[PDB]
């Protein structure tokens, strides 16, 4: 297991466009397009995303770069930040893995609420981090993904993946 591995059993992969949990169009593996009900405007989002007139469809190799670069954003994300350069540096391999996962699914603004949670977590608080990580509107909306990544940070092993 990796980082890779686990986002990509985390986020599913699809072809076309589609609205996640929320309503928002995604596409691919977990690629967020548009906050917007629009659907042209998803559209619009996807061949710039693509660079070419995709009329809402992909394909793997396709899917597979958008994944690339927003893997490698999380990670950026993660190192470009103040308080969460430090924390991640702190953590193993695991851990790190599975924040990265957070910060690709919420962003570095939704990462902004676990502070507390990531604090417990570098005081090595597991059990109590976790229960605080399932009180959020992340946990809420997909709770089968979000209690993988919370057993992952608990744990620090990959047994949620088996
Ligand atoms: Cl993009
Ligand atoms: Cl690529
Ligand atoms: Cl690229
Ligand atoms: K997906």
Do not use: C
């Not at 699809?14 to 906050?35: F, P």
């Not at 710039?48 to 396709?62: H, L, M, P, Q, S």
């Amino acid at each position: 297991m990796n980082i890779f591995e686990m986002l990509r059993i985390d986020e599913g992969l699809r072809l076309k466009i589609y609205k996640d949990t929320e309503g928002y169009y995604t596409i691919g593996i977990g690629h967020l397009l548009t906050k917007s009900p629009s659907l042209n405007a998803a559209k619009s989002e996807l061949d710039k995303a693509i660079g070419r007139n995709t009329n809402g469809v992909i394909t793997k190799d396709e899917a597979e770069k958008l994944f690339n670069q927003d893997v490698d954003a999380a990670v950026r994300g993660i190192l470009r930040n103040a308080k969460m350069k430090p924390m991640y540096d702190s953590m193993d391999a695991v851990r790190r893995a599975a924040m990265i996962n957070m910060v690709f699914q919420m962003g570095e603004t939704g990462m902004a609420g676990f502070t507390n949670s990531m604090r417990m977590m570098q005081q090595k608080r597991w059990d109590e981090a976790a229960v605080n990580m399932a009180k959020s509107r992340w946990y809420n909306q997909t709770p089968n993904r979000a209690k993988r990544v919370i057993t992952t940070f608990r744990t620090g092993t990959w047994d949620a993946y088996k």
